[PDB]
Nucleic acid binder design. Structure first.
Length: 108
DNA sequence: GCCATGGCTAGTA
DNA sequence: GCCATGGCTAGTA
């Protein structure tokens, strides 16, 4: 499979995560049949434009935290979105935001 | 080509 | 560890 397809397949899968659930880079990656490709799902999400109607906020790492995402710390926005979805998050010592995976985890 | 740089993470320590 | 992108440079031609 070529990139650009992959992407389309990701976004498809991401568009499938239910309102108020979530998944992880890792899961998605395996979902679309390329388990080794977490990081890239990462990047697929990165490249989307704001105007997207693709649920990129519903994807976080396997440690139930909002991925660091150093460049453009304006990922604060991912938090907001997720709260208004009802999902409930808190911070940590060392900052970060985090939630209860077993609950919110989309178990397809 | 070799190398650093990422919204990573299963399995060690 | 895994793996794409993209910016350097040995060193072929």
């Amino acid at each position: 499979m070529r990139m650009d397809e992959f992407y389309t397949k990701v976004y498809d899968a991401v568009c499938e995560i239910p309102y108020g659930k979530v998944s992880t880079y890792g899961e998605i990656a395996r979902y679309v049949g390329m388990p080794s490709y977490a990081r890239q799902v990462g990047q697929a999400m990165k490249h989307l434009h704001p105007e997207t109607h693709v649920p990129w906020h519903r994807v976080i790492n396997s440690r139930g935290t909002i991925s660091k995402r150093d460049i453009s710390a304006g990922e604060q926005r991912q938090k907001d979105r997720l709260e208004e979805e009802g999902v409930e998050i808190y911070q940590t010592s060392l900052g970060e935001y985090k939630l209860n995976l077993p609950e919110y985890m989309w178990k397809p």
